[PDB]
Amino acid sequence: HMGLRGDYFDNIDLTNFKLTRVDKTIDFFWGVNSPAKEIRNDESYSVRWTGKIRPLYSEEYTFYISRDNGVRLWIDNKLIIDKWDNLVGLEMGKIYLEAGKLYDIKLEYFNNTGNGFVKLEWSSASTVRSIVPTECLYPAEPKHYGSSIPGKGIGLFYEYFDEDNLTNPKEKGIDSVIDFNWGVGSPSKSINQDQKFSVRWTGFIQVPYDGDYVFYVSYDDGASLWIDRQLLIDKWTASEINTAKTEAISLKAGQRVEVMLLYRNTGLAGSIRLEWEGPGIERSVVPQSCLYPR
Numbered sequence: 001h002m003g004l005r006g007d008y009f010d011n012i013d014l015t016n017f018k019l020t021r022v023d024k025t026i027d028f029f030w031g032v033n034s035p036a037k038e039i040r041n042d043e044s045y046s047v048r049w050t051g052k053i054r055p056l057y058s059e060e061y062t063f064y065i066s067r068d069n070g071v072r073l074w075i076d077n078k079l080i081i082d083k084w085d086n087l088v089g090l091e092m093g094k095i096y097l098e099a100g101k102l103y104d105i106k107l108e109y110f111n112n113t114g115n116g117f118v119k120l121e122w123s124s125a126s127t128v129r130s131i132v133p134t135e136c137l138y139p140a141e142p143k144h145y146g147s148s149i150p151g152k153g154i155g156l157f158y159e160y161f162d163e164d165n166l167t168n169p170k171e172k173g174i175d176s177v178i179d180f181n182w183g184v185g186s187p188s189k190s191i192n193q194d195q196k197f198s199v200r201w202t203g204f205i206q207v208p209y210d211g212d213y214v215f216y217v218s219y220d221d222g223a224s225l226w227i228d229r230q231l232l233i234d235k236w237t238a239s240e241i242n243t244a245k246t247e248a249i250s251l252k253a254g255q256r257v258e259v260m261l262l263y264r265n266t267g268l269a270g271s272i273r274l275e276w277e278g279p280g281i282e283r284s285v286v287p288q289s290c291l292y293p294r
């Protein structure tokens, strides 16, 4: 097989996996739209490509990247282009390689609003500058993503607001999990891209195992968490990047815990994650399987 394995993530930071596929070459121009139907069309996404690269010659290779936005490129486990930033780069790194030998390649990429593109070229004394071609790329095996916790959940209900104070609603729906890092983007193109917006998630968490749980909310820059109509985390005006947690709560398998999670961005970047720890559950995003909208 030819190409590299692309793992596509719904956030700017290589979190919240939505799709793996084999891409024949790294040569993408996405405009302001998503790379794939599985990735929310909100202008905040990221990709990791992994596999092997086979040069034809025993020569110093130059790798060229065109990027919007950030890229990191490792060849033979050496980071040769380290450009994980919000600029637009039209980037080089050099490395000596041996003819016919297979080398590791890893390329990480993000889009943080606006246009998204990434193109990988190479040259050497005997290699005319070109897109790195498919016949020189071999895809990695898929890495598994996703929780082992079973259950019939489908997500929480969401309401997206154009103001930072839970007003001017623009969209509603279901979010599979609460694991978001939009950078300076909004949760949907229906929400103006001004870094001042808010979200209400509602529904129920159905508990998988008898024992004690702690909920963690990591936010930029305000959040409040209601559990069974008790306000357990009151950080609405915290205007900071931080994490907060509940006390331990004894819960039973099958118990339905009513949840209301309020979130806001008031400027610059925005992110929010709902995690838990529990019996047999290391601190981790509360999974879709345990989230219900009603």
Ligand SMILES: [Ca+2]
Pocket: 010, 011, 012, 040, 042, 043, 044, 045, 181, 182
């Ligand atoms: Ca996104």
Ligand SMILES: [Ca+2]
Pocket: 068, 069, 111, 112, 113, 114, 115, 116
């Ligand atoms: Ca961009």
Ligand SMILES: [Ca+2]
Pocket: 162, 163, 164, 192, 194, 195, 196, 197
């Ligand atoms: Ca706004």
Ligand SMILES: [Ca+2]
Pocket: 220, 221, 265, 266, 267, 268, 269, 270
């Ligand atoms: Ca912020």
